[PDB]
Amino acid sequence: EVNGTISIGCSSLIGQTLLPEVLSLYNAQFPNVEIQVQVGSTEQIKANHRDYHVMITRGNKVMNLANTHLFNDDHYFIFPVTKLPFIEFQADPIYINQIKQWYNDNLEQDYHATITVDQVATCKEMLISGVGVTILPEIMMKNISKEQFEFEKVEIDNEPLIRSTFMSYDPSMLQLPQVDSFVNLMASFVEQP
Amino acid sequence: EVNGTISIGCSSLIGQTLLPEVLSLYNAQFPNVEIQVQVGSTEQIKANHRDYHVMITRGNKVMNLANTHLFNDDHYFIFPKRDDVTKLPFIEFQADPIYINQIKQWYNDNLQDYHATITVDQVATCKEMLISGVGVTILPEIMMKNISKEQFEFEKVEIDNEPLIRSTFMSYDPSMLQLPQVDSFVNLMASFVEQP
Numbered sequence: 001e002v003n004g005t006i007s008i009g010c011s012s013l014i015g016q017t018l019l020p021e022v023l024s025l026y027n028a029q030f031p032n033v034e035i036q037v038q039v040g041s042t043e044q045i046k047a048n049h050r051d052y053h054v055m056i057t058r059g060n061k062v063m064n065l066a067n068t069h070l071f072n073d074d075h076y077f078i079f080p081v082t083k084l085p086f087i088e089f090q091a092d093p094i095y096i097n098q099i100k101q102w103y104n105d106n107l108e109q110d111y112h113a114t115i116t117v118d119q120v121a122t123c124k125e126m127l128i129s130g131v132g133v134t135i136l137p138e139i140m141m142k143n144i145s146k147e148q149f150e151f152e153k154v155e156i157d158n159e160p161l162i163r164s165t166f167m168s169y170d171p172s173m174l175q176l177p178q179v180d181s182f183v184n185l186m187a188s189f190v191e192q193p
Numbered sequence: 194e195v196n197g198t199i200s201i202g203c204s205s206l207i208g209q210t211l212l213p214e215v216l217s218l219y220n221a222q223f224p225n226v227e228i229q230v231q232v233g234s235t236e237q238i239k240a241n242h243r244d245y246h247v248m249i250t251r252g253n254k255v256m257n258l259a260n261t262h263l264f265n266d267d268h269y270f271i272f273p274k275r276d277d278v279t280k281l282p283f284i285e286f287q288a289d290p291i292y293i294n295q296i297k298q299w300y301n302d303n304l305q306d307y308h309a310t311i312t313v314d315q316v317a318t319c320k321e322m323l324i325s326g327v328g329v330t331i332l333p334e335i336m337m338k339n340i341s342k343e344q345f346e347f348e349k350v351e352i353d354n355e356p357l358i359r360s361t362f363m364s365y366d367p368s369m370l371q372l373p374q375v376d377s378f379v380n381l382m383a384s385f386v387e388q389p
Contacts, residue, residue, distance in 0.1 A: 012315075015313070015315070015317075015318040015321070016317060016318060016321045017321075019318070020318070020321045020322045020324070020325035020327055021325050023311065023322065023325075023327050024325050024326050024327045027282060027310070027311070027327055027328070031282075031310075034309075034310060034311075034312075035310065035311040035312070036311075036312050036313075037311070037312070037313040037314065037318060038313075038314050039313070039314050039315055039318055040314075085220060085224075113227075114220065114224075114227060114228065115216065115220065115227075115228040115229075115230070116228070116229050116230070117208070117229075117230045117231075117232075118230065118231050118232050119205075119208070119232055121208075121209060121317065122208040122209060122212075122213075122230060122232055125208070125209045125210075125212075125213045126213045126216065128213070129213035129214050129216075129217050130217050131213055131216050131217050131220055132220070143339070
């Protein structure tokens with residue numbers, strides 16, 4: 001009975017972790033809805049906001065839209081250290097600067113990124129294949145061998161480095177049944193029992 | 194010693210499969226080279242070709258560049274462990290239309306009419322959608338690692354028949370070979386893709 005098209009734009013990391021799980025529920029409850037997913041950078045998604053009924057991004061609340069905080073991720077420094085290449089991914093400069101500062105503080109030498117990549121997913125695969133060491137958000141940490149790697153929680157002044165994920169939309173869109181459906185499902189999905 | 198910076202642009206699927214393996218080798222041999230990787234659509238990459246010293250894309254050779262064929266992928270139709278499979282949603286990814294039309298055609302021939310219920314941009318998302326039980330899909334074989342052979346069956350895609358294959362290419366401006374870090378990367382790829 002609910003049946004249009006919903007166009008979702010989200011951070012790339014979300015598209016390989018949260019979103020498939022969410023879409024399994026959604027499609028099961030609303031099978032007659034056609035789903036389009038586009039992934040990319042937050043800044044990309046925000047730039048293209050008009051293409052999307054709903055955006056899921058990382059960083060901060062988006063301007064002139066409703067926002068729902070979905071969750072926070074912790075971070076882990078992952079290594080087989082000063083001599084190994086650090087793999088840096090692309091994000092807003094405040095967050096990268098927290099990681100740089102942490103590396104400078106808790107390691108001996110100066111932070112230098114030998115390899116820089118767009119996406120966290122690529123970064124993780126670079127890690128798994130031995131290219132170097134990196135820091136990951138914990139939601140990206142599954143299927144990394146606990147035998148080959150060590151995991152150290154990243155804290156700054158004894159407070160975990162965290163990143164927030166948000167769902168953003170124009171409240172007016174809730175007039176579209178298929179969108180209202182997705183936003184409500186999502187309010188439920190992000191609560192913990 | 195080889196240094197400077199190399200800027201690589203590739204298809205998104207390549208950044209999770211081939212490229213880490215290649216970059217482990219490359220960084221081991223040429224530790225003083227700074228590496229930048231950008232992933233995306235073959236369209237996107239080719240559009241931004243001036244940001245990149247080297248591109249690795251899927252489809253066909255790129256125009257006004259040197260091209261090196263790297264390899265070919267087979268394809269598998271993947272579904273929960275089967276002939277009640279047309280009642281399940283099919284997940285389509287974005288690629289050039291000839292390629293997508295082969296997949297559609299094969300579906301129509303071998304199964305109901307093709308209809309994508311979920312469409313996503315990247316093959317990797319498509320695979321994670323598969324793993325999470327959203328539906329069934331066709332994947333290139335290089336994307337099939339870690340898909341539980343306990344939960345899923347794998348059927349090879351053939352068209353008259355003639356497996357459905359997709360080609361990967363490395364493209365570059367031959368003048369770039371004057372940059373030692375680029376000449377290095379390209380020669381390394383030449384042997385990386387050969388098989389013992």
